[PDB]
C-alpha cells in the first residue's frame, strides 16, 4: 500500500481499516480491526507505519508489506484512548486518553509500556503537538486547554468558556494560529509567540468564531496554513480563511427532505500538501473527498459496511 | 467572647425551646417541622442545663404521641456523649414505649442489633425498659423479626453470596485472608445448628461438604499450603453450582420448611409492621399466610403477605441483602416534604404529595416493604406496552448495536452519534399512549396525566437534594388510579451512584424523553417546570427542616455501606447543604430556582449526559 | 360457543336515521332508538340477550351503547362502515344537545380505546370535529386530548391558542405557561395577539392589547366582546358600563346578545337596574342565565312568586348542563 | 338549620347520590329538587370533594410514619381493565356487569325476571 506517493486511510466501527488511493476511488485492501472499534488513525511522517488508536490498545499497521495482520497491538491503557501523534523522527508517540491520562510511548524500541505520563482532571479530547516538537496541547472535557512543555514538564491550563467538552485541537506548521473546537459549535483561534526554548509559548486569544449551533468534532489547519477546516455534527463542515476567519465554503451531506434526517455527522478532515483537496469521513458509513475551491463531490469512497470515524492522509511529491 | 456567645446562644435558645414546645402543643399533628427543630436544638444545645429544664418542661407538658413523628432521629442521637442529651433521650424513649411501644420497638429491635457498642448498649437497656411492662410484645417482636431474617435470605442464600464472594477475592483480589474473614461467619451459623426443617435439610445436603472445606483450610491454616485450600475450592465449586442450579426452582417458599414459627403464632397482639397510628384502633396480626412468593430478582425478595386483625390482607416485600434504613429515613424525609407542601396553599391546591410506602427494617441488612397496591413499574409499563403493540421492547438498543455493536466501547461524541440515532429514529411516546390507553376516560387521562407529571417534577427535585441515583425504569412506578409516580428503591442517595467508578451517573434526575413525552404535549417548559420551581421553593425555605432530618445520616453509619465516617458524612450534608441554598453548581455563586432547574433539566436532558449512562438505566426510555 | 350473529345491516344504518331529527327530545328519542337498536342487530349473543331487558329499561341501553357499537361496527364492511361514518358525522354536526354530543363523545374515545382503532370519522379520525364538539359541549378534557393530538400532529398557532383557553378552562394556569412558552420558542416571530392574554387570565395585559389594537379601528364587535371580557374580569364595572353605554346604541342584534349578559353584570355592578332590565331583554328565555337575571331583575322589583318561578325555570334549564357536566 | 358545607364532608357519598340522581331519574320535579339540595349545600369546592371522598388524604400522605394499605366499573372502565383479552369475551363480561348492576338492585325487582 505504500508505493503510491499520495495515501490515505480510512476507519469505523466495522471493526475494518481500509485505505484508499486519491486518484483510485477503490479501496485498496481491507484489514480486519477486530474486538473494538477505533478512534483515530495516524500516518507516521516518514511513511513506514499507521497507529490506530480505538479501544484499550493501539495497533500498528505496516505501509510496505501486503496484506499483513497488525504487527505490534499495544497494550495496557485500562479504557479508551482518544488520539494519536508523533516526532517527526517517528520515535517518539503522542497520545491521549480517556482516563485522564496523556501518555508518550517509544516507537522505535521493544518497549511495552508507557514512557511519560502526564494527568490532567478531566478526559483527555484530541491532542495535537506544536510543529517544533516540543509543546503539547491537550483537549480535555472540561474545556481547559492544557499548554505541556516537553522539556519542562511544565503544566498551564487556559478555559475559554467554563464547563465545556472541548473536542479537538489543531496548530498549523507555521506556528502561527492555534485553533480549538468544542461541542457548543465555536472556534477559537489564538496567535502563537515565536519562541524555541525561552519557555514563553504564549498563546494571545483572537475573536471567536460561532462555527456551528451543533456540536463541533474536528478542526484541523492545512499544511500551508492558508485554510481550517471545521466538521461538526450538524453534517455541515465549514472551510474558514485563515486571513480573516471569512467563508465562502460550505459542505454538507443533507438530502433536503425532512423525512430523511439524521443522516450522519461529519467526523473528521484532512487538508493536502497543496490545500486544494480536502477527505472527510461520515458516519453515514461514507468518507467524501471535495474540492476547497469549487465544493463539489470528487469522490466517495464506498465499501464501508457501517459508520466511519477517522481518517489519516499523507502526500508526497 | 467564647462566655458572650454562649450567654447569647442560651439566652435565645431556652426562648426558643419554650415557644417551639407551646406551638407543637397549640399545633397537634401538624408539628413536623416544629418537632425537629425543637431536636435539632436538643441535639445541639441540650447539654447546657438552662435549655435541659426547659426541654425536661417542655416534654412533661407536651402530648407524647408528638414524638412519634421523629422517633428515628432520636435513635440516631441514642448514644450521644453528652450526659444529659442522653439522659432526656433515655426517659423520652422509655415514655414512648410506656404508651406507644408499638411504633418504637422495631426501630429498638434494629439498633439493639448495632455493632456500636453504646448504641447496643443504649438501645439494650431501653429494652428492658420496655420489658419491664410489655415482656409480652418484646420478646413478640424480637421472635418475629429474627424469623423474618432467617426467612429473608435462607442458609442456601447467605452460603451461595459468601461462595461468589470467595470467587471474587481468592482470583480477582488474591485476598486469601478476606477469603477468611468472609467465610468465617458462615461457619459460625454452622455451628449454631440447624433450626428449621429447610435449614435441616440443606445441612443433609450440602453440611458434610462444608465441613470436609472446612477441615481442609484447617489444614491450610495449620500448616500454610494452598493445596489444601485448592481441595477446599474443589468442594466450594461443586455446591455452588449445585445451589446455583437449585435457586431458580425456589418460586416459591412454605413456611413449615423455612420458619414454622410464623404457622405456630396466631390472633397475635403485634401490630401489623408499618400500621401503628395512635388515633385509630391497632390493627393486629392475626395470622401469616401460609405461602411467601419470591421474585427472580438478583436480592430475592420475598412477596410476604399477612392476615390482620381487621380481617384485610397486607402484603409486604421482606428484602435480606438491602439496608432499610437509608429507605427508611428517605419515607420520613418524603413525610416531611409532604408536610412542607401541604402547609403552603399553592402547592396544597396542586396536590403534590409524595407516593409512599412502609418501611420496616429489622437489621442492617433486611427489612420490609410496604407493597404499594396497583401500581406498575415504568419498565413493566413499557414492557406491556409493547408486548400488546407488537412492538419490540429493545428496539433502540438494538438500533444502537446496528450503528455500534459496540455500543459501551465508544468515545463520549460517538456515543452520542449511536444515542441520537436511536433517539430519533424512535417515537419514544410508549408512555403518553400508554397513560391514554390505561385511562376510563379523558376526565380521568387528564387527572392522571397531571398527577403524574406533578408528582415526577415533586420526585426529581427531592430525589435530586437528596441525591438519589440509580433511577431505572424498574426503580419508578406508576398507579393505575391516580397515575402519580413512586420511587421505590433507595440503595444509591447521595450521588452514591455519581461516583462509582463503574458506569458513573451524570445525571441528577430520570427525565428521559419518554417521560418528557407522557408531559403536556406542550413539554416540560409548563407543569413540570413549574412545579420543580414550587418545590425547590418550599424546600429552600425550610431547608432547615430537610437538614433536621438529614442529621439521621451524620449520625448513624448508615452512609458507610472512626473520623473518616464523620467526614464522610459532613461532606455529604455539605453538598445537600449546596443543593438546597443553591450553590451545588458553582460554589463562589448562589442560584435562583429558576436558574438553578433550568441548569438541572439540562443536565438530566442533555445527550452528553444520558448517553453515558448504564445500558440497563434505559436513558433512550 | 354459540358464534356470532348477523347484524342486520339496513336496519343499523336505518337506525342512525338523523335526516327528520330536530327538536330536544326527537335526539333523545334517535338516541334510544339507536341505542336499543345496536343491541337489536348486536353480533354478539350476549349483547343481544341484554336486548330485551334493555327495551323496559333504557339506563341499560345507554350502559351497553359503547360496546353494542363496536359489536356492529366489527361486522360491517369497509362501504358499511363508511356510510356508518357519515351518518355519525351528521349526527355530530347536526345539533349540539348535551346528552347525544355526550354519548357520542364517549363512544368517540371508546373506539380509541379499542383495539379497532380510532373511528376514520373524517380525514382527521373526526379529531378537529371531535375537539370542537368537546368545547362546545362544555367537556373540556375529551377537548384537550383532541387538541394535544392536533399539535402532535402539527403544531400552529391556532392550536396553541385552542390549547391554552383549554388549559385554562381545566384551571391549569401553569399548562397554559408552558404554552405561553413554547409558543414564545417556537413562534417568537408572531406577534402574540390580545386573545392570548385574554385565555391566559393576564386580564390586565388583555385590556391594554385590546385599548391598543381598538384606537386604530373604530367599533370593531369582537374587540369590543374582548375588551368587555377582560373589564368584567378586572371588576371595572364603570369603565364596562361606560363601554355598554357608549356601543350599546350601534351593535348589531345578534352581537347585542353576546353584549347584554357583560352589560347586565355590569348595571347590577353598579345598580342602573332599568339598564338591567334594558339588556337582560335580549338575553334568551330558553338560557339558565337569561332566567336567572330575569329572577334578579324580579326580586330588585320585589315580584317573589316571579321571581321563583323563574328561579324554578333557571334550575330547569341548568339541569341538562349539569347532568352533562 | 344552617346545617350547610359539613354535610358533605359528614356524608361523603351525600355530593355523589344528589349528583347521580340527575343521572338516573327524569322526573323534572325531582331533579329540581336535587339541584335545589345542591345548591343549598353549597358548591362545594372540588378539593375539598376530593378530600371528602378520600382521592386526597393529607392525614396520611403528611404522616412521618407511612401506613400500610389495607388490600393486596362502567363500560369504558371496562374496557381498560379488559383491552388485553380480546372483545368477543368483552361483550359478556360487560353485558354480565350491566345485568348484575340491575339485579342486585332490588327496586327494579319488576325487571329480575329478563334480567335472569
Ligand atoms: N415498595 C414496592 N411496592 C410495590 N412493588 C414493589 C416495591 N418494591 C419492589 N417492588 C416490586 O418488586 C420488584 C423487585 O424489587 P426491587 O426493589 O427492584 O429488588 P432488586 O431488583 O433486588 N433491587 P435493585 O438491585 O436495588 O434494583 C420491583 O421491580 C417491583 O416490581
Ligand atoms: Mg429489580
Ligand atoms: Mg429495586
Redesign the interface.
Known sequence: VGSDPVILATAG?DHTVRFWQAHSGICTRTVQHQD??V?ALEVTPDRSMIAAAG?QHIRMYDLNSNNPNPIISYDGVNK?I?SVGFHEDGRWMYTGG?DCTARIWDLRSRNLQCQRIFQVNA?INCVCLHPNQAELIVGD?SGAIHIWDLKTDHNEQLIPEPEV?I?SAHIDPDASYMAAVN?TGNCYVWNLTGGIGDEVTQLIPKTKIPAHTR?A?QCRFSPDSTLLATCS?DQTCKIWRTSNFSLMTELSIKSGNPGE??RG?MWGCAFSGDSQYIVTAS?DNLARLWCVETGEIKREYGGHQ??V?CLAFNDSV | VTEDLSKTLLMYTVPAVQGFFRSISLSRGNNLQDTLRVLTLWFDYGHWPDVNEALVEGVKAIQIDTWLQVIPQLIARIDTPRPLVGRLIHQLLTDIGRYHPQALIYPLTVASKSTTTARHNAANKILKNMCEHSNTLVQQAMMVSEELIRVAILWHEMWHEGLEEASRLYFGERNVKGMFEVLEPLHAMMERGPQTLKETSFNQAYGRDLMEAQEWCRKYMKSGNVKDLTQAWDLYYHVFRRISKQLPQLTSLELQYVSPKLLMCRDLELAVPGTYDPNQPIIRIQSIAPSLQVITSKQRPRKLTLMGSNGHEFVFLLKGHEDLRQDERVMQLFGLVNTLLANDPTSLRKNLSIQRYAVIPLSTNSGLIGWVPHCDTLHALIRDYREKKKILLNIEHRIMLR????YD??????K??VF??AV??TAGDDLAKLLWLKSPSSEVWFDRRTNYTRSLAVMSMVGYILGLGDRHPSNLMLDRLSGKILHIDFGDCFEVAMTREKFPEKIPFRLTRMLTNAMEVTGLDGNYRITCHTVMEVLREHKDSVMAVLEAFVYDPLLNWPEALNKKAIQIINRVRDKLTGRDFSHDDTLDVPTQVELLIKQATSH?NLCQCYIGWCPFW | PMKKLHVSTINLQKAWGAARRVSKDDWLEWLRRLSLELLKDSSSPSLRSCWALAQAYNPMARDLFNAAFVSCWSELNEDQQDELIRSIELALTSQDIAEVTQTLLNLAEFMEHSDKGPLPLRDDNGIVLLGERAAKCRAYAKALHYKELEFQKGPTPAILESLISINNKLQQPEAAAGVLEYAMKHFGELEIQATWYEKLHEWEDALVAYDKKMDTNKDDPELMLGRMRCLEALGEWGQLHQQCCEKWTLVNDETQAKMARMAAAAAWGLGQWDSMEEYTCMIPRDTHDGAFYRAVLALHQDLFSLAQQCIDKARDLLDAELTAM | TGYVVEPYRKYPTLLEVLLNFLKTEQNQGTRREAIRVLGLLGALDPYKHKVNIGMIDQSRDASAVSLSESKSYSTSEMLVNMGNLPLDEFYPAVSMVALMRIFRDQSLSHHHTMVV
Open positions: 466501527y473494538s472499534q478512534n479501544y479508551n482518544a480517556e478526559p472535557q467538552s473536542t461541542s456540536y468534532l455534527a434526517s439524521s455527522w458516519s457501517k459508520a470515524v | 450503528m455500534a455493536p459496540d466501547h465508544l468515545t463520549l461524541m460517538q452520542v452519534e441520537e440515532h430519533n429514529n452528553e
